[PDB]
Amino acid sequence: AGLLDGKRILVSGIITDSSIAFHIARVAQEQGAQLVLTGFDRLRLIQRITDRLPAKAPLLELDVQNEEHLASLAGRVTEAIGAGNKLDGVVHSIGFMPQTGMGINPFFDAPYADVSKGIHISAYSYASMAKALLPIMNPGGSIVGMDFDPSRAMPAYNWMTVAKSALESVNRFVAREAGKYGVRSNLVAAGPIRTLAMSAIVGGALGEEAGAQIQLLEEGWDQRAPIGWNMKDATPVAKTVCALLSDWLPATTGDIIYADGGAHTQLL
Amino acid sequence: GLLDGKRILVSGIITDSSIAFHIARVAQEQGAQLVLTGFDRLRLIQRITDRLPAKAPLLELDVQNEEHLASLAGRVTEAIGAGNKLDGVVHSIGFMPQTGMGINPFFDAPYADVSKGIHISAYSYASMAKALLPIMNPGGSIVGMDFDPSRAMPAYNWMTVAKSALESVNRFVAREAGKYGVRSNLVAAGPIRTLAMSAIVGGALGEEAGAQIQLLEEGWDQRAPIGWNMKDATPVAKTVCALLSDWLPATTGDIIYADGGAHTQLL
Amino acid sequence: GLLDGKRILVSGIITDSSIAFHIARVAQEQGAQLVLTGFDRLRLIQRITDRLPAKAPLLELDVQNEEHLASLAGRVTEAIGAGNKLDGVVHSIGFMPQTGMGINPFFDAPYADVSKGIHISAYSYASMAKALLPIMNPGGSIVGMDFDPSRAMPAYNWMTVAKSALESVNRFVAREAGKYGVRSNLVAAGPIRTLAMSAIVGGALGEEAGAQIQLLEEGWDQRAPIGWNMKDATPVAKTVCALLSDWLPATTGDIIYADGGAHTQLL
Amino acid sequence: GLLDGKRILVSGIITDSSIAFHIARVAQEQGAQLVLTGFDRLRLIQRITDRLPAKAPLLELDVQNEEHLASLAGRVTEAIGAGNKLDGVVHSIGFMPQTGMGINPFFDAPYADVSKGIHISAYSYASMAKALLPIMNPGGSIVGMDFDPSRAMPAYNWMTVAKSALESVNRFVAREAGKYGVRSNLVAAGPIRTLAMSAIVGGALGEEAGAQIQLLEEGWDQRAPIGWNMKDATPVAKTVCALLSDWLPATTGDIIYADGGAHTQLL
Ligand SMILES: NC(=O)c1ccc[n+]([C@@H]2O[C@H](COP(=O)([O-])OP(=O)(O)OC[C@H]3O[C@@H](n4cnc5c(N)ncnc54)[C@H](O)[C@@H]3O)[C@@H](O)[C@H]2O)c1
Ligand SMILES: NC(=O)c1ccc[n+]([C@@H]2O[C@H](COP(=O)([O-])OP(=O)(O)OC[C@H]3O[C@@H](n4cnc5c(N)ncnc54)[C@H](O)[C@@H]3O)[C@@H](O)[C@H]2O)c1
Ligand SMILES: NC(=O)c1ccc[n+]([C@@H]2O[C@H](COP(=O)([O-])OP(=O)(O)OC[C@H]3O[C@@H](n4cnc5c(N)ncnc54)[C@H](O)[C@@H]3O)[C@@H](O)[C@H]2O)c1
Ligand SMILES: NC(=O)c1ccc[n+]([C@@H]2O[C@H](COP(=O)([O-])OP(=O)(O)OC[C@H]3O[C@@H](n4cnc5c(N)ncnc54)[C@H](O)[C@@H]3O)[C@@H](O)[C@H]2O)c1
Ligand SMILES: CC(=O)NC1CCN(c2ncccn2)CC1
Ligand SMILES: CC(=O)NC1CCN(c2ncccn2)CC1
Ligand SMILES: CC(=O)NC1CCN(c2ncccn2)CC1
């Protein structure tokens, strides 16, 4: 039947219909998953985006920087999925970095106040969410987060790479904690996708030739990747997140699955 | 079903303990039409495979034999019907002479023996890919079996060196397979109690090496955040099926760790 | 002498147990003219450093303080001489509030505390590099202290996350330093018995974390093919000096493992 | 001098372009007493090694030859004097037949050729270590030459597979050498324009070699934060000397990257 048939999954990180989280939600719904969605700040606006999804799913406010939002989260999810019901999956598709820590802005010129906000949202929050939702999760469950390979330094990504490095390490500790509940915790290291964060927020930080800079990335990535890569299609990444939410990778935890077309395994 | 309407070649079945036996079993449970290859003890392999959920054709394949590999693509077509192609290939073949493993010192392994080991455990992954890529479908997958060789461990000795060579081979195969729209990956499994494994644990290859593997196993389940049961090959078989499916479409030249998460934990 | 006629800034001396104390000692033994930075307890730091082979100027430096970093380059030149530049910088600074390490649960660390930890242990490496690269000579070297964070270990918790962030910071610093002809590297040391470490082993931060560190040490010496004596910081200090010298000229944005070889061995 | 009063065996000199020639030169400049091993073209090697800063004995050594390896330890003692031991061994031996490396397709390499390559490039590191560890001093060092095989690159094909196998062999040698107080490491050099390399690359690119080598040279220099000059083997030779010295005493079974830091940068 459906890959995620009869599974209750919380999905965070939907802002646009371009968002990786939107496509994860779409593919999971196509596979018979009952979703619960998280939104940040503009909640009346996110509802209009999620209305374009295959099916109706409850939407909850969640600012990961907000301690009251996280404390109330587990209870708010239960009132949304029914008492005596638990989650089978959690998707962390949250990332942020102030522009001072991106693009052409010099690496040394990023104030720690900005880098800290970035690390809080992009890495610390993965642990914040896991703490908040593990009590309402089922043994056999899965936590999946989004990653960009930070093992080698790349220009323009700067302090966002540092937060991804921190995230990769956070995921390994979460794995230990989640393990006590019979829950797996993994990251999907995706290749580039023309989402809003990329196209607009990262693109903004690149200056005059930003457009060709982003196009050169797709071209070089499609080149390295033995099976090619399309920055305009989030479906391969969404499918990979669903594979992790399913019961088909049962002995995989505290790990990184590379959904990048195989570009990381190739030098040229 | 997960592998519904998929033609998959599975190699490496010798016992009902074999990782390939469990891959075959789970694949069949998921609606896959299999083709099986066997080495040397074919009478026994028929007998073993007869206990699978469904009947699947069995073909002779010694990876060291050039005539066997040259005829392989044609023999598979004659078994799956003309104008039909494979959607998956499972390489679950491994070998290392007794001199290259266990209590026998690392330096006392003759190159003739280490070479046989490398031929079968690593070079053969490329031999099979060359042989079967022409009869594969775009969207298909090649999956091989691996043990994490990034750190040196006692007793595994020269098999670690063959698995290191294999990890590298897999990355070149991905380039070649990529031209056909085929993915190539390895599943890095945790220690599994096959017949050889439990014989070695019973100090067959030697007592010092016997307790070594036993410490490895106990250590693996401690380190693994979700635990590791070396008496259950089903998590590994399920992971190979995930790779054969259409659910990891952007993953190639890679290693998926189906080891209970132990490679990520120091203690 | 290995570092003959070299001006090196050394940070991170607080006791005679400090890895920075031994780096300073070995560097001085090799003909290096040092400049030392101290944090908060300067009266004590003056007093410790007085027991070094030679007299070296001591400067106040809180990496969390923006005024301290802005004035740093000037203060160093007032200490080494006008028209003189540094040939080396040693970052031996680390910190993590008690809620981020030890027996305290991983999930119970407030971000305010984790942030302080990351600021001092990782961000500061970039803060120091920004501050001192203008007063550095082409051929120069920046060396930082690291603990291998690639695998998660109990008790280290959020200090591991800061080390992971540091490894990444070092790779970007490498790019920046490269413009000045300066190398940037980290020395991944094995566990060393500092006063802090010796305290934890005595169940200061809780018996469960005390036993954990003891198993870590015991395991490290087993794994290390040449052994690991956590009561001897001299091998680590010698490794930092090799990086400060002109003998690893093509090595930048990297990690040198001074851990007895433990990271390469599974058992 | 860095290697003052040290007896070092150096293998792999064939041309004045050879990485082993530059290691020998720098080691001699630092006060090392050398012993040289040569293969096949000994008449030519003698003439080349006369152009070195000092006279060093030359011994025949085909790593494929079992009689050569069995007699090696005795031949070295007869050359360095009885009761004297080696403090260092340099393995700068590599080989891959045309079919396994170049413009020839990955799948078109016969195993007979790939096996010769693996024997010489990887297995030999263990062969030499077995042969010379009995005549080595505690504190001693074995150093081998490696090209980063972690990611697959075009043309390098099976030489990458042998480098992968080598990285793993070095980790096992590290365990064996550890029993004698000997360290075992690899230097992961960036591309060096040696005569062997020029022909390998030159032969692969055909007529279109000019422009492509220029982009390749420019590519390395960009990626390397401190730059990379293929015409200069001195940074690599200096790095091998740092490993032969007493300045990296707690580093074994490891890889030191002398590539200008190119491996740490994505672009
Ligand atoms: N686009 C790529 O190339 C790419 C590649 C790899 C990984 N990623 C990762 O995928 C994830 C999603 O990014 P995307 O590219 O889909 O773009 P996006 O714009 O859709 O995602 C950013 C999301 O983070 C949320 N967010 C930010 N701060 C928050 C806070 N304080 N509390 C709650 N939510 C907050 C935003 O509301 C938004 O939905 C991120 O983790 C990103 O780093 C993106
Ligand atoms: N058992 C474990 O703990 C474990 C863990 C990780 C990986 N593996 C790997 O999984 C694979 C399967 O091993 P296993 O543990 O199931 O043991 P196994 O003995 O059941 O499987 C090895 C197979 O290789 C076959 N083979 C040997 N020489 C051959 C040749 N010349 N031509 C063709 N086939 C040949 C054997 O007949 C056998 O079927 C191997 O690659 C092994 O290295 C095993
Ligand atoms: N001890 C080990 O086992 C070990 C192993 C590997 C790496 N390390 C690393 O080596 C470094 C030194 O640690 P150590 O073991 O010598 O202990 P330590 O306590 O002697 O060193 C840490 C130093 O950080 C300094 N510091 C703290 N806050 C500061 C601030 N705001 N500004 C400037 N300096 C500040 C302290 O004065 C102290 O000198 C740390 O980065 C640590 O992570 C330690
Ligand atoms: N040149 C580069 O760009 C580069 C980069 C990284 C690593 N390396 C490595 O450096 C080493 C030296 O390579 P090079 O570029 O100086 O080329 P080279 O041809 O000058 O050196 C290789 C040596 O191997 C010897 N050799 C071959 N077969 C032998 C055998 N059977 N027995 C004994 N010796 C044998 C040759 O006589 C020769 O001296 C090799 O291990 C190579 O893989 C080279
Ligand atoms: C753990 C692992 O990889 N095991 C392999 C080892 C090589 N091999 C084997 N070798 C000799 C006799 C029978 N089998 C197959 C199983
Ligand atoms: C091995 C390691 O990382 N050690 C560090 C830990 C953090 N730190 C510290 N934090 C608080 C009090 C004193 N020291 C410095 C030493
Ligand atoms: C970069 C690298 O690994 N270079 C090696 C390759 C193998 N080799 C060689 N192979 C065939 C003929 C002569 N030399 C020596 C140089």
CSV table of N, CA, C and O in Angstrom, one decimal, chain B residues 106-111 114-115 118-119 123 126 129-130 133 149-154 157-158 160-161 164-165 168-169 171-173 175-176, chain D residues 106-111 114-115 118-119 123 126 129-130 133 149-154 157-158 160-161 164-165 168-169 171-173 175-176:
chain,number,residue,atom,x,y,z
B,106,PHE,N,49.3,-10.5,10.7
B,106,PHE,CA,49.0,-9.7,9.6
B,106,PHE,C,50.1,-9.8,8.5
B,106,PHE,O,49.8,-10.1,7.3
B,107,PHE,N,51.4,-9.8,8.9
B,107,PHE,CA,52.6,-9.9,8.0
B,107,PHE,C,52.8,-11.3,7.4
B,107,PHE,O,53.5,-11.4,6.4
B,108,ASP,N,52.1,-12.3,7.9
B,108,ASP,CA,52.3,-13.7,7.4
B,108,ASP,C,51.3,-14.1,6.3
B,108,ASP,O,51.2,-15.3,6.0
B,109,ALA,N,50.6,-13.1,5.7
B,109,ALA,CA,49.6,-13.5,4.6
B,109,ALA,C,50.3,-13.4,3.3
B,109,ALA,O,50.7,-12.3,2.9
B,110,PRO,N,50.5,-14.5,2.5
B,110,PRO,CA,51.1,-14.4,1.2
B,110,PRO,C,50.3,-13.6,0.2
B,110,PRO,O,49.0,-13.6,0.3
B,111,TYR,N,50.9,-12.9,-0.7
B,111,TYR,CA,50.2,-12.0,-1.7
B,111,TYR,C,49.2,-12.8,-2.6
B,111,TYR,O,48.1,-12.3,-2.9
B,114,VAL,N,46.0,-12.9,-0.4
B,114,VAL,CA,45.5,-11.6,-0.3
B,114,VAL,C,44.8,-11.2,-1.7
B,114,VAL,O,43.8,-10.6,-1.7
B,115,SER,N,45.5,-11.5,-2.8
B,115,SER,CA,45.0,-11.2,-4.1
B,115,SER,C,43.7,-11.9,-4.4
B,115,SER,O,42.8,-11.3,-4.9
B,118,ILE,N,41.0,-10.0,-2.6
B,118,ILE,CA,40.7,-8.7,-3.2
B,118,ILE,C,39.9,-8.9,-4.5
B,118,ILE,O,39.0,-8.1,-4.7
B,119,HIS,N,40.2,-10.0,-5.2
B,119,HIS,CA,39.6,-10.3,-6.5
B,119,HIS,C,38.1,-10.5,-6.2
B,119,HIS,O,37.3,-9.9,-6.9
B,123,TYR,N,37.2,-6.5,-6.5
B,123,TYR,CA,37.2,-6.4,-7.9
B,123,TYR,C,36.0,-6.9,-8.6
B,123,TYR,O,35.5,-6.3,-9.5
B,126,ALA,N,33.0,-4.6,-9.5
B,126,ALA,CA,33.1,-3.9,-10.8
B,126,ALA,C,32.9,-4.9,-12.0
B,126,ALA,O,32.2,-4.6,-12.9
B,129,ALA,N,29.1,-5.3,-12.3
B,129,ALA,CA,28.5,-4.1,-12.8
B,129,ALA,C,28.8,-4.0,-14.3
B,129,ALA,O,27.8,-3.8,-15.0
B,130,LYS,N,30.0,-4.3,-14.8
B,130,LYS,CA,30.4,-4.3,-16.2
B,130,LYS,C,29.4,-5.3,-16.9
B,130,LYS,O,28.9,-4.9,-17.9
B,133,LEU,N,25.3,-4.0,-16.3
B,133,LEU,CA,24.8,-2.7,-16.6
B,133,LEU,C,24.1,-2.6,-18.0
B,133,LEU,O,23.0,-2.0,-18.1
B,149,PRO,N,35.5,-0.2,7.1
B,149,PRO,CA,37.0,-0.4,7.2
B,149,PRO,C,37.8,0.8,7.6
B,149,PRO,O,39.1,0.7,7.6
B,150,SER,N,37.2,1.9,7.9
B,150,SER,CA,37.9,3.2,8.2
B,150,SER,C,38.8,3.1,9.4
B,150,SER,O,39.8,3.9,9.4
B,151,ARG,N,38.6,2.2,10.3
B,151,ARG,CA,39.5,2.0,11.5
B,151,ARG,C,39.9,0.5,11.4
B,151,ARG,O,39.1,-0.3,11.0
B,152,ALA,N,41.2,0.2,11.8
B,152,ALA,CA,41.7,-1.1,11.8
B,152,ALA,C,41.2,-1.9,13.0
B,152,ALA,O,41.2,-1.4,14.1
B,153,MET,N,40.8,-3.2,12.8
B,153,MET,CA,40.4,-4.0,13.9
B,153,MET,C,41.1,-5.3,13.9
B,153,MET,O,41.3,-5.9,12.8
B,154,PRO,N,41.4,-5.9,15.1
B,154,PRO,CA,42.1,-7.2,15.1
B,154,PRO,C,41.2,-8.3,14.5
B,154,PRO,O,40.0,-8.2,14.4
B,157,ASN,N,41.9,-8.3,9.7
B,157,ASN,CA,43.1,-8.1,9.0
B,157,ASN,C,43.0,-7.8,7.5
B,157,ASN,O,42.4,-6.7,7.2
B,158,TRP,N,43.3,-8.7,6.6
B,158,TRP,CA,43.3,-8.4,5.2
B,158,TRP,C,41.9,-8.3,4.6
B,158,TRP,O,41.8,-7.7,3.5
B,160,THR,N,39.7,-6.3,5.9
B,160,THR,CA,39.5,-4.8,6.1
B,160,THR,C,40.1,-4.1,4.8
B,160,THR,O,39.4,-3.3,4.2
B,161,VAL,N,41.3,-4.5,4.4
B,161,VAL,CA,42.0,-3.9,3.3
B,161,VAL,C,41.1,-4.2,2.0
B,161,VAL,O,41.0,-3.3,1.2
B,164,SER,N,38.2,-1.8,2.1
B,164,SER,CA,38.6,-0.4,1.9
B,164,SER,C,38.7,-0.2,0.4
B,164,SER,O,38.2,0.8,-0.2
B,165,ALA,N,39.3,-1.2,-0.4
B,165,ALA,CA,39.4,-1.3,-1.8
B,165,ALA,C,38.0,-1.2,-2.4
B,165,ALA,O,37.7,-0.4,-3.3
B,168,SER,N,36.2,2.2,-2.4
B,168,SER,CA,36.7,3.0,-3.5
B,168,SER,C,36.2,2.5,-4.9
B,168,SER,O,35.8,3.3,-5.7
B,169,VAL,N,36.1,1.2,-5.1
B,169,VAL,CA,35.5,0.6,-6.3
B,169,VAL,C,34.1,1.1,-6.5
B,169,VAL,O,33.8,1.6,-7.6
B,171,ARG,N,32.7,3.8,-5.7
B,171,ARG,CA,32.7,5.2,-6.1
B,171,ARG,C,33.0,5.3,-7.6
B,171,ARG,O,32.5,6.2,-8.3
B,172,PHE,N,33.8,4.4,-8.2
B,172,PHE,CA,34.1,4.4,-9.6
B,172,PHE,C,32.9,3.8,-10.4
B,172,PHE,O,32.6,4.3,-11.5
B,173,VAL,N,32.4,2.7,-9.8
B,173,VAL,CA,31.2,2.0,-10.4
B,173,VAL,C,30.1,3.0,-10.5
B,173,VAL,O,29.4,3.1,-11.6
B,175,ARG,N,30.1,6.1,-11.2
B,175,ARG,CA,30.4,7.0,-12.4
B,175,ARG,C,29.9,6.2,-13.6
B,175,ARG,O,29.3,6.8,-14.5
B,176,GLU,N,30.3,4.9,-13.7
B,176,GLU,CA,29.9,4.1,-14.9
B,176,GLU,C,28.4,3.9,-14.9
B,176,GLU,O,27.8,4.1,-16.0
D,106,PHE,N,37.4,2.4,-16.9
D,106,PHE,CA,37.5,1.8,-15.5
D,106,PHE,C,37.3,0.2,-15.6
D,106,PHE,O,38.1,-0.6,-15.2
D,107,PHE,N,36.2,-0.1,-16.3
D,107,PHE,CA,35.7,-1.5,-16.5
D,107,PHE,C,36.6,-2.4,-17.4
D,107,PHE,O,36.5,-3.6,-17.3
D,108,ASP,N,37.5,-1.7,-18.2
D,108,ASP,CA,38.4,-2.5,-19.1
D,108,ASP,C,39.8,-2.8,-18.5
D,108,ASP,O,40.7,-3.2,-19.3
D,109,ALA,N,39.9,-2.8,-17.2
D,109,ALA,CA,41.2,-3.2,-16.6
D,109,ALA,C,41.2,-4.7,-16.2
D,109,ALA,O,40.5,-5.1,-15.4
D,110,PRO,N,42.1,-5.5,-16.8
D,110,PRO,CA,42.2,-6.9,-16.4
D,110,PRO,C,42.7,-7.1,-15.0
D,110,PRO,O,43.5,-6.3,-14.6
D,111,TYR,N,42.1,-8.1,-14.2
D,111,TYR,CA,42.6,-8.2,-12.8
D,111,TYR,C,44.0,-8.5,-12.6
D,111,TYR,O,44.6,-8.1,-11.7
D,114,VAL,N,45.5,-5.0,-12.4
D,114,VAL,CA,45.1,-4.4,-11.2
D,114,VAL,C,45.8,-5.0,-10.0
D,114,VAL,O,46.2,-4.3,-9.1
D,115,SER,N,46.0,-6.3,-10.0
D,115,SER,CA,46.7,-7.1,-9.0
D,115,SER,C,48.1,-6.7,-8.8
D,115,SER,O,48.6,-6.4,-7.7
D,118,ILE,N,48.2,-3.3,-7.1
D,118,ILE,CA,47.9,-3.4,-5.7
D,118,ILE,C,49.1,-4.0,-4.9
D,118,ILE,O,49.4,-3.6,-3.8
D,119,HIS,N,49.7,-5.0,-5.5
D,119,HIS,CA,50.9,-5.6,-4.9
D,119,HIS,C,52.0,-4.6,-4.6
D,119,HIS,O,52.4,-4.5,-3.5
D,123,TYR,N,50.3,-3.6,-0.9
D,123,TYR,CA,50.8,-4.7,-0.2
D,123,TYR,C,52.3,-4.6,0.2
D,123,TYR,O,52.6,-4.9,1.3
D,126,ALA,N,53.4,-3.2,3.6
D,126,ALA,CA,53.4,-4.2,4.7
D,126,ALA,C,54.7,-5.1,4.5
D,126,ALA,O,55.3,-5.4,5.5
D,129,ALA,N,57.7,-3.2,5.8
D,129,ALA,CA,57.5,-3.1,7.3
D,129,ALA,C,57.9,-4.4,8.0
D,129,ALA,O,58.7,-4.4,8.9
D,130,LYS,N,57.4,-5.6,7.5
D,130,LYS,CA,57.8,-6.9,8.0
D,130,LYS,C,59.3,-7.1,7.9
D,130,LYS,O,59.9,-7.5,8.9
D,133,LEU,N,61.2,-3.9,10.3
D,133,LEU,CA,60.9,-3.6,11.7
D,133,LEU,C,61.9,-4.3,12.7
D,133,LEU,O,62.3,-3.6,13.6
D,149,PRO,N,42.5,9.2,-1.7
D,149,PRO,CA,41.5,8.4,-2.5
D,149,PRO,C,40.1,8.4,-2.0
D,149,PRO,O,39.2,7.7,-2.5
D,150,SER,N,39.8,9.3,-1.0
D,150,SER,CA,38.4,9.4,-0.4
D,150,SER,C,37.3,9.7,-1.3
D,150,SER,O,36.1,9.2,-1.1
D,151,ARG,N,37.6,10.4,-2.4
D,151,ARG,CA,36.6,10.7,-3.4
D,151,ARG,C,37.2,10.2,-4.7
D,151,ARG,O,38.4,10.2,-4.9
D,152,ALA,N,36.3,9.7,-5.6
D,152,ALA,CA,36.7,9.2,-7.0
D,152,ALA,C,37.0,10.4,-7.9
D,152,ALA,O,36.3,11.4,-8.0
D,153,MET,N,38.1,10.2,-8.7
D,153,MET,CA,38.5,11.2,-9.7
D,153,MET,C,38.7,10.5,-11.0
D,153,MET,O,39.3,9.4,-11.0
D,154,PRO,N,38.4,11.1,-12.1
D,154,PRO,CA,38.6,10.5,-13.4
D,154,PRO,C,40.1,10.3,-13.7
D,154,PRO,O,41.0,11.0,-13.1
D,157,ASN,N,41.6,6.1,-11.7
D,157,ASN,CA,40.9,4.8,-11.7
D,157,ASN,C,41.4,3.8,-10.7
D,157,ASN,O,40.9,3.9,-9.6
D,158,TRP,N,42.2,2.8,-11.1
D,158,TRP,CA,42.6,1.7,-10.1
D,158,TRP,C,43.7,2.1,-9.2
D,158,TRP,O,43.8,1.5,-8.2
D,160,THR,N,43.6,4.9,-7.5
D,160,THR,CA,42.8,5.3,-6.4
D,160,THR,C,42.4,4.1,-5.5
D,160,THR,O,42.4,4.3,-4.3
D,161,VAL,N,42.0,3.0,-6.1
D,161,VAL,CA,41.7,1.8,-5.4
D,161,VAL,C,42.9,1.3,-4.6
D,161,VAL,O,42.7,1.0,-3.4
D,164,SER,N,43.4,3.5,-1.6
D,164,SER,CA,42.4,3.2,-0.6
D,164,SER,C,42.9,2.0,0.2
D,164,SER,O,42.8,2.1,1.4
D,165,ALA,N,43.4,1.0,-0.5
D,165,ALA,CA,43.9,-0.3,0.1
D,165,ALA,C,45.1,0.1,1.0
D,165,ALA,O,45.2,-0.4,2.1
D,168,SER,N,44.4,1.7,4.4
D,168,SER,CA,44.0,0.7,5.3
D,168,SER,C,45.2,-0.2,5.7
D,168,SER,O,45.3,-0.5,6.9
D,169,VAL,N,46.1,-0.5,4.8
D,169,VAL,CA,47.3,-1.3,5.2
D,169,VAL,C,48.1,-0.5,6.2
D,169,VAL,O,48.6,-1.1,7.2
D,171,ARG,N,47.1,1.5,8.6
D,171,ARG,CA,46.5,1.3,9.9
D,171,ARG,C,46.9,0.0,10.5
D,171,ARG,O,47.0,0.0,11.7
D,172,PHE,N,47.0,-1.1,9.7
D,172,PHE,CA,47.4,-2.4,10.3
D,172,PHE,C,48.9,-2.4,10.6
D,172,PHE,O,49.3,-3.0,11.6
D,173,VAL,N,49.7,-1.9,9.7
D,173,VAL,CA,51.2,-1.8,9.9
D,173,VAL,C,51.4,-1.0,11.2
D,173,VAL,O,52.2,-1.5,12.1
D,175,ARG,N,49.8,-1.0,14.0
D,175,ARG,CA,49.6,-1.9,15.1
D,175,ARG,C,50.8,-2.8,15.3
D,175,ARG,O,51.2,-3.0,16.4
D,176,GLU,N,51.3,-3.3,14.1
D,176,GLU,CA,52.5,-4.2,14.2
D,176,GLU,C,53.7,-3.4,14.6
D,176,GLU,O,54.4,-3.9,15.6
